[PDB]
Design a protein around this ligand. Structure first.
Ligand SMILES: Cc1ccc(C)c(C)c1
Ligand SMILES: Cc1ccc(C)c(C)c1
Lengths: 114, 128
């Protein structure tokens, strides 16, 4: 399976901790703008109030241990100018005790097709 | 619940090749992501104190790759652009995908040099 295009590390509550350069560039965001704040508040997810609410719901789902995978549109190309379709996933990351300590957000472009 | 925040963090693929590293870890070791991306974590400057520390990180990454959680105190080249040694509480967390395969490893590091040094002053004050 091809490596992600977009990756982000969130805490268990969905706060942004780390994001790769490709995601930062494509949404036109700096890590300092979004670090420590909820992921769904970042520009990728801001097409509308509903895309933000959708993302908030997927994060909360991951926080409680459910793996998420779905197709979503984000402001994710040319510095936040262009919408792309992304195959999106959230992986809860657990410690040995089984506690969710981080979430891993991954994204892979699917716009070229179709 | 809560946990002390990492200071160093990195994402490796299942075989320990470097995918992502935060700015604090890169500047502590004096390296750029581009120097180490796509190559084994154990080759990165942090682990280059000797052939041994290198060899050791390699085995830990292989352990984590098979699904075992790793955690140990170790000294790395992690301050003044990779020139000075610091003690770190080090962990490697295997990350499984929905399908159950290990897809990544998350390397974390908290600097514990201050805590070791205090421990040692106080053990001294204990005899005196
Ligand atoms: C960090 C990150 C991961 C995954 C996605 C879709 C985005 C937009 C950002
Ligand atoms: C990313 C990273 C680099 C170096 C170290 C020691 C740790 C713990 C994490």
């Amino acid at each position: 399976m091809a490596l992600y295009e977009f990756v982000g590390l969130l805490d268990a509550h969905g706060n942004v901790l780390e994001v790769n350069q490709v995601a930062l560039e494509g949404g036109g965001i700096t890590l300092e703008e979004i670090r420590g704040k909820p992921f769904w508040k970042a520009r990728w997810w801001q097409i509308s109030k509903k895309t933000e609410a959708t993302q908030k719901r997927l994060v909360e789902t991951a926080s409680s241990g459910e793996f998420v995978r779905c197709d979503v549109e984000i402001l994710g190309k040319s510095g936040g100018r262009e919408v792309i379709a992304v195959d999106f996933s959230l992986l809860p990351i657990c410690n040995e005790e089984g506690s969710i300590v981080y979430l891993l957000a991954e994204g892979r472009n699917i716009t070229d097709k179709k």
